[PDB]
Nucleic acid binder design. Structure first.
Lengths: 138, 125, 137
RNA sequence: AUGUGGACCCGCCCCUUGGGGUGUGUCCAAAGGGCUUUGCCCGCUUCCGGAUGGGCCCGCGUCCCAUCAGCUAGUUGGUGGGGUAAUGGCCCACCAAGGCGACGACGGGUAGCCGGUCUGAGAGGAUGGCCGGCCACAGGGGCACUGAGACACGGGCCCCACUCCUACGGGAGGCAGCAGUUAGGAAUCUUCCGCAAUGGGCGCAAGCCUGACGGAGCGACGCCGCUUGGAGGAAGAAGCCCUUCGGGGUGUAAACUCCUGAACCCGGGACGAAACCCCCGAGGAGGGGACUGACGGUACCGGGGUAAUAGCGCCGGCCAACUCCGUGCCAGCAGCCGCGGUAAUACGGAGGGCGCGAGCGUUACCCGGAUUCACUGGGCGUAAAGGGCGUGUAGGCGGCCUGGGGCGUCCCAUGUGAAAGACCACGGCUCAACCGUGGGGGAGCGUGGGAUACGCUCAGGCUAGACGGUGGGAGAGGGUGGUGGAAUUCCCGGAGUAGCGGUGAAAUGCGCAGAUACCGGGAGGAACGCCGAUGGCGAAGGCAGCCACCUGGUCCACCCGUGACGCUGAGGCGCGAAAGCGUGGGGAGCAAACCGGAUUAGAUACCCGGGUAGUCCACGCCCUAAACGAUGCGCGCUAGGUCUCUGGGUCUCCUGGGGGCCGAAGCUAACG
RNA sequence: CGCGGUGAAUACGUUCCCGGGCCUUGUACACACCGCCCGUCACGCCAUGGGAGCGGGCUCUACCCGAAGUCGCCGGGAGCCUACGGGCAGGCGCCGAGGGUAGGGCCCGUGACUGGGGCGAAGUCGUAACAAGGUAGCUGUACCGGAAGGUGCGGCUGGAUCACCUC
RNA sequence: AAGGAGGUAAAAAUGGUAAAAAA
RNA sequence: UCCCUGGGGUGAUGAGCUCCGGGGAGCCGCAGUGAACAGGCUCUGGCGACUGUUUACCAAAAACACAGCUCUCUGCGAACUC
RNA sequence: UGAACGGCGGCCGUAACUAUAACGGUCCUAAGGUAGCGAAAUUCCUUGUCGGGUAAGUUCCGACCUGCACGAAAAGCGUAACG
């Protein structure tokens, strides 16, 4: 089935990030490779590779965490706080130069797919090329 | 309503009703009148409040109230159809003003002389 | 019908505002605004101007009178409300003597307890229904 | 006539919608006036080019009601005509059936549109008056004419009203131009001055019309600036508010003090306007002199100098500010909640204090808070809300991979977006309100190139979705025909007799005319005991003895096939508890409506004896609900313990699909 | 009221009667069951639907008459110019504002009478719902009743616990 | 035998009593 | 009146003869289906549903009839009827 | 046994202006007229009261209902088509 394996991925991400499981798998595609590329490239996930399950190409992602605090329960804090799919298959966003997010007023990242490949906020802004606003993460 | 359904139909705008149709954009109308009576507010009151029927100058029999204590009015006055109900007289919309073409406020008033007629208490001393 | 009435009130709205004189004042006890003035031919011709160029259909009537009334004798009856209903009753056996007096005095009743029967909450209320059953003879 | 040229016609070269040339043949011109006259000024004739406004056309955006669903025969199209500056049926004729519509046609309510404007962080909502652009109207309607231009506000014709002048034969008139009357409404002004400045029409100029324009008047209607005073001034007079009789307040406020100095008096006194004009040169460029103010002697400059208006909402929480008498659910205030029903901080008065001050409250209209029609920015287990459930159209959207497209999209070049306002900057009036000037940001579509990441387009391909093959499998899953027993009422038979029945108690009831009870055989209908369950199947409503027939739904194993055939599905489709309806058959039990009985004040009800519709069959119609998992469907993801039904496997275990409960995380306002 | 001489029976048990306490539970109750709370009939006020119809605004079609004017043609036994070709005046013909007649369609105003709804310190009658509300509630429905309501067929929990078969 | 939960049988002769209100 | 023209028939698929038809201009009066046959129309109640039948010789109707409905009698030697 | 002949009551009181009577009492009988229609081919008072229609309307349509003396198959109601 699927209607955006992309969003289902970002979702499985949210899953792992919340349930705290060192890694999680998500099927093979160029675009997701680009995404996870961005993620690892900005100190978020823990890495990825072209794997296989049952004879079916997949793409697994290992993900980051932080230190274990005391007091209010042992729960260690998160690095990949949250991600939201912005340009849904109905919200086909088409940002450009003067546009483009500023994600948590400073930090964050705008993941956007443009004329020349998959660029981030500061990136695509610097490149002076825009396109679809994939998702947001911080 | 998934973007699509919102695009096709839409989300209809509030739309008022004017809970005070003195109408014409006119909130001051030339209150003729008929009847006086009394009536009462809910559970713990009892007073007077007229009913001034006014006819405005375009329709409506309303129930024009008054500015309270100190009236004469009889049956014309030009009760200036105003606007504002209370927990009394199931109407109290479109009040009366004093000064207008009749009433000129309470015989001796020291505050609400912005409706209650009385000019400038020039007690000559 | 009183629809033509406030209409004729506009008529006055240019009658009692052109010729000072007359007084268009309504008797309290009865309806109908009294057109008062100083002259037979006065009111007659003002009335001419009415059906003439203001055209009003009002069968020009005789002025009514403020009728009151009373009695002429001492009466004693039983005001017994021997009526239970749901259990709450609300019953009242009142025993009044009534006395009448001169055309011009005023209104009188007396704090008249035979000793101390009827509650003192009725003293300012048992007379009300007396004063109440008096607005209509 | 004169004919550079323009116009048509048939050809011809180039074009490409009627663009430009060209070969033949015919048509058209002209106005002259002035004078310093042999030359020029002003105008005239024929065409081409610009300057300038518009005509037509498309693209595009453009209020609401679906309770407005169909609309159209000048209607959609052509050929051939007519007309306009001209494309086109806009109109003639002739003709082929088409022209629009849920992308909301047709209808009708409503409405001038914009550059702009107020509010909200913004998205946007509402708005369009002064001003600037485009439109439309001329009392309503038709209508041409004139002409460069009109269907023409102070031009024409006609009908319609409507009002006026007359001698009543006849005739006139349009303030939606400008001041001013009246109707109207809560409300919107002077029956004014000058063409001095600019601008328009005409004249060679001098100049002329201009209620355009440029000025005063009136209204706190808006915004701006501004005086009513400074400074000394009491343990603080008195006047008045309050009190525990000590005082507290009012208030340096006042008075007394000195200082300045609105208003006002005298004097002088503007910019706003230098061109036009005559004069040297040539009538050109240039040079000189001279004329030209409505406001008004107002602005302003100098001097003389008077302390010289203060109000409006409020003091119950939102909302900043309380004390005293009265008033007593009365008089009354109130946007909300409410407050007073005889000691009101909400009424009403009086001192004080909160706010604002040439102003303050009131109402009305609009935007916000209202994230309270949510795009930013919401929701549908129980608050408002899943459509009773499956079907399917269009539509919406869409799996992995290669490459072509370059439509959506992104990039910079670039046209326009006027002016004005919005912003900053500089400036003008002695500040501001207000205006002078420079410059950039600017949506937006046009045109150029450029990127191809993503949707989509194109060709080819893959298996993870979907589907099919084969093979086993579970079931009260439906349509039909058949058949077993139990058990209720009933018919004949037989045997027996003092009651049964029924209930909280009783009674109506049936009974010696032989009932309730038991034995023998027959009738007939409807529903299935145990199994059997907290279970099974089904899309929902539903399904229960068992035989057989036809028949859908689905499950697992094998990886054999196809190759995205996909999820949902506004309408349309079908379906359906029980009741109910119709045309017929049938009725044992059952039972509303109806009757009796008891009961209670009442018993039209529950409780008792009867009895009907109906509950059954076929066929048709109705199609509703707590149709309830109150939870739409499809995919993937996020702990596991356990109870169980079914599919496969050598099996104290795994694994696929289901059915209950528990409880990670997570969610909720909470129960969950 | 207080004080004393004599001097018992009998309590197994919690089956049922009275009450309190505690826990559970239900809840629409909150000076709170001496609570709340629905429906007719009654009095008044306010729109509203309906209603023999009346009134009216817009618009719809077919047809009768038809001004000015454009256009089309004729200029004929005749009018005037004719620069004779024509022109002008005029003549008939098209469309045509307007009124007329009949029949629609839509909307508002409206009217004896009539349904219902709201409201208004306490009306009369009953007590259904909320504790099994004293008959478990609630609903689809069909018949009934002064009215709330009743009841058969069905369905639904937002219904029911000594203690009966499991989780 | 503990709870908690899931489907079956139980148990009320009748009850009318108002109200502006007091914090 | 005059010009134009379409198909059925008969004969042959036409001349003739026939049937039914369409268009365009044109002529005259008071009016052209020129005379004779030839329907006034609409609104709204009442009863009867409906076409009908009946008192020849006063009635045509709301009376009777009617298709339809219930009720009952009839087991064949029907019941009913003479 | 009532789509068999038939019949299908009366009086007293009671609604916090009044008027009304859902409501209680009460003698009677076999049982007290349910639905629908109603000044009717039925209504005496009657030319009832109201509304429309008209210059005026005992006629007429519509409506109210104290039905002298409508009403269930001697049927009640209503109905397009015919008369």
């Amino acid at each position: 089935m699927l209607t955006d394996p992309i969003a289902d991925m970002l979702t499985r991400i949210r899953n792992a990030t919340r349930v705290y499981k060192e890694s999680t798998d998500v099927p093979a595609s160029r675009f997701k490779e680009e995404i996870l590329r961005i993620l690892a490239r900005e100190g978020f996930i823990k890495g990825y590779e072209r794997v296989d399950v049952d004879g079916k190409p997949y793409l697994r992602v290992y993900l980051k965490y932080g230190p274990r605090r005391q007091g209010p329960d042992p729960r260690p804090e998160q690095v990949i706080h949250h991600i939201r799919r912005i340009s849904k298959p109905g919200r086909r966003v088409y940002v450009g130069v003067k546009e483009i997010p500023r994600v948590r007023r400073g930090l964050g990242i705008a993941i956007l797919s443009t004329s020349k490949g998959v660029l981030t906020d500061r990136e695509a802004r610097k490149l002076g090329v825009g396109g679809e606003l994939i998702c947001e993460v911080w | 309503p998934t973007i699509n359904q919102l695009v096709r139909k839409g989300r209809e705008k509030v739309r008022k009703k004017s809970k005070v149709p003195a109408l014409k954009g006119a909130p001051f109308r030339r209150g003729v009148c008929t009847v006086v009576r009394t009536v009462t507010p809910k559970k713990p009151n009892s007073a007077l409040r007229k009913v001034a029927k006014v006819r405005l100058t375009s329709g409506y029999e309303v129930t024009a109230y008054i500015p309270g204590e100190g009236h004469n009015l009889q049956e014309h006055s030009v009760v200036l159809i105003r606007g504002g109900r209370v927990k009394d007289l199931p109407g109290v919309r479109y009040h009366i003003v004093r000064g207008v073409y009749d009433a000129a406020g309470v015989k001796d008033r020291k505050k609400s002389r912005s409706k209650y007629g009385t000019k400038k208490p020039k007690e000559a001393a | 019908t009183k629809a033509d009435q406030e209409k004729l009130s506009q008529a006055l709205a240019r009658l009692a505002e052109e010729d000072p004189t007359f007084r268009v004042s309504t008797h309290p006890e009865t309806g109908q605004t009294i057109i008062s003035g100083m002259g037979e031919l006065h009111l007659e011709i003002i009335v001419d101007r009415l059906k003439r160029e203001f055209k009003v259909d009002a069968n020009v009537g005789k002025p009514q009178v403020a009728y009151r009334e009373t009695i002429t004798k001492p009466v004693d009856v039983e005001g017994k409300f021997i009526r239970q209903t749901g259990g709450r009753g609300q019953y009242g056996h009142v025993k009044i003597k009534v006395e009448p007096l001169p055309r011009g005095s005023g209104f009188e009743f007396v704090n008249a307890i035979v000793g101390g029967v009827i509650p003192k909450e009725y003293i300012p209320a048992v007379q009300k229904g007396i004063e109440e059953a008096m607005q209509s003879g």
